[PDB]
Amino acid sequence: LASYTANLAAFMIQEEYVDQVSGLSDKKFQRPNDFSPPFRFGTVPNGSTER
Amino acid sequence: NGTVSPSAFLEPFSADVWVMMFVMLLIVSAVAVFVFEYSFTIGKAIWLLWGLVFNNSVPVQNPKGTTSKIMVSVWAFFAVIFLASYTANLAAFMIQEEYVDQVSGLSDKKFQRPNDFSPPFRFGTVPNGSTERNIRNNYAEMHAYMGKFNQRGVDDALLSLKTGKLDAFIYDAAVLNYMAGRDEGCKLVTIGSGKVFASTGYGIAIQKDSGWKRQVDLAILQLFGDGEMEELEALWLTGICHNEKNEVMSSQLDIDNMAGVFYMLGAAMALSLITFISEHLFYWQ
Amino acid sequence: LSGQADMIVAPLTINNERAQYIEFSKPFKYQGLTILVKKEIPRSTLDS
Amino acid sequence: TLSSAMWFSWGVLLNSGIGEGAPRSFSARILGMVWAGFAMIIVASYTANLAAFLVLDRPEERITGINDPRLRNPSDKFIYATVKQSSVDIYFRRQV
Amino acid sequence: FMNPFQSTLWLLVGLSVHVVAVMLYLLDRFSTLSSAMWFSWGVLLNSGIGEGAPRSFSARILGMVWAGFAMIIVASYTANLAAFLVLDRPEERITGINDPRLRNPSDKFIYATVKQSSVDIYFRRQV
Amino acid sequence: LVTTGELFFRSGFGIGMRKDSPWKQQVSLSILKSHENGFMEDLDKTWVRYQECDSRSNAPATLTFENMAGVFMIVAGGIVAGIFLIFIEIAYKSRA
């Protein structure tokens, strides 16, 4: 029990985070409509990335 | 190697909540006795409460009153929260503990007189320099004693002190700082958070009553002002690791950092034995 | 420089704009420049 | 009974050491086993999370000297000053 | 078994446990050696075995202090074991080209590169 | 108020005076003697470094009375509710 509690406490300090979106090939961007929360992203028009 | 904290077991949970929990024990014991009134004893109740608060180690006998069960359960909740918080706080304190150098400075008991102490506090310095002259006049007896361990080189002294044959060193601040910052690791430290005694400085000696001093001094001050010296420091007088609140690690929990608990246990046992012996004559009378 | 006084025993810095007119003695205290900024307030235990 | 089961299930969670009784079937044994495991894991997680929260401290800006980008390129929301006509204003003007 | 501890402490705690058992047994007999030793051991490792109980009030005080001592020992052991599993070696490493170990290496740092390549020109073309 | 950063433009202090004067050598020698002897160490220990509350960087605090309410007030409310439930139970026991 002592070792388990110590290991859990040590691990919780190290815990990092993982980005919400994998990339631009994620299914969230591919299929935005069929998601319960309304996903929305915007870009500045009349540029180069938009084209 | 290690950290100094003899009060680690008492550093968390300052002595303001212990009295509160004690008076809580008495008040709930009284209310439980009153509730049970309408084979009970206050001793069994206090024994059960004290055992329950300390991880339920003591195998005490539980009461039977229905109203007492609610109080027992809420006390168990309180004790569980207490123990969890105490363990977390102790871990937090143990992680963040720091270290302090053994010697406070040159003007200290450990340096003033080593004859009336543990095996000799060995130290020394390289002779034929300003440090020897500075040491001699102020403290003659230290110069008298120190004239037995004198090296003939900074590298040799560092090597000897690394292997434990020597335990202290006294030399110029700049070379010591550079050696501390550019060694195999930095298991070597200078006492005090950057402490200097008799700060004088360096300079460029010139011949007496010459006509060059004004121009050289003005040029040096111009070099200082123009900003062409900080980069020089970074280039030629920099180190790798920083000796600022390191707190590397500690282990093995030796008796030096924990003797307080056994001292308190012995004192409590002696007091209990003395009062038990004293109660015998009162019982006989 | 106007003959009103004879010593400036005070916190006077040393640089090159002054050292061309008056003669400074050996420094009696070393120092540098350093920023000073207000600090925030730590947290607490909230609801136990 | 209902009361005995409630007392046992409360005591095993709270570590109270109270109640009299025990299950009889060979599946209620496993049910009590997983219940005790749940209690232990929840207590351990609580302790670990409290210890983690009581250690980590959020950082701040903490300007790192004269090379900090906040000082070098100033905006309208960061004003820093010094006493006029001193040895500091000279050092900030003799350079380019 | 002994990574976050020392053997001397183990021997000392065993001797203290036996001394406490002897003291409680003597106090009980003066005004139950097996009961005392089993009670002390069961308190130490938090085991449900043992049905013995003390009688004198002084023995109640020793039992209370024994429980406190066991609790503090277990808590300190757990906390120190947790502290050792996070604080690792500093493991200093080269920052880049501005690390002082690269400018002037005497004998214990040799770093090379591929002969006649695009990086040799970069070093040769800067004083 | 806290102090950050690292020292730059490290130029010491000094005692100014006019270019032509007969006190220069003696004044410099006296200041150097006061430095070497140890007088300035005594002076600093009294006027500039008598020390006050420290700042540090981590400051691990001890768990004070600031968390007590949500525990001991809860205990008091629980014991009051237990008294009320004991009264209710002793009233209901007569009926059944």
> What sign results for the dihedral spanned by CA atoms E52, E53, E54, E55?
negative
Minimum distance, in Å, between the CA of residue F16 and any CA atom of chain D? 14
- How many Cβ atoms from other residues are within 10 Å of residue D53's Cβ? 14
State how far Cα D90 lies from the chain centre.
48
F8 vs D65: CB contact, 8 Å cut-off?
yes
F15 vs C9: CB contact, 8 Å cut-off?
yes
The experimental technique used to determine this model is cryo-EM
Measured distance CA(B216)–CA(B227) in Å, rounded = 17
With 0-12 / 13-18 / 19 or more C-beta atoms within 10 angstroms meaning exposed / middle / buried, residue B28 is: buried
Interface B–F counts its CB contacts (< 8 A) at: 74
Tokens of B177: 């700082």
Instruction: Output the CA–CA distances (angstroms, integers) from residue B105 to B157, D27, F64, F87, in the order listed.
Output: 20, 71, 35, 70
Phi, psi of C37 (to 5 degrees): -135, 145
Tokens of B80: 């569980």
Q: In 3D, which of F21, F60, E54, E123 has the Cα closest to residue C43? A: F60
- Residues across chain B: 285
The H-or-E segment that residue B81 falls in is helix B66-96
Of C13, C17, C40, the CB nearest to D60: C40
Alpha helices in chain F (DSSP H): 24-37, 39-47, 74-95
Give residues with Cβ within 8 angstroms of E103, minimum separation 6: B235
Residue of D nearest to B59 (CA): D17
Minimum distance, in Å, between the CA of residue B204 and any CA atom of chain C? 14
Resolution (A): 3.8
State how far Cα F25 lies from the chain centre.
44
D18 vs B62: CB contact, 8 Å cut-off?
yes
Supply angle C-alpha B32, B34, B36, rounded to 5.
Answer: 65
C15 vs B225: CB contact, 8 Å cut-off?
yes
State the DSSP code for F8: B
Chains F and A touch (3+ CB pairs under 8 A): no
Measured distance CA(E84)–CA(E61) in Å, rounded = 35
Measured distance CA(C47)–CA(F68) in Å, rounded = 10
Tokens of B157: 């002294």
Which residues does chain F have within 8 Å of residue C27's beta carbon, measured at their own beta carbons?
12-14
A13 vs E86: CB contact, 8 Å cut-off?
yes
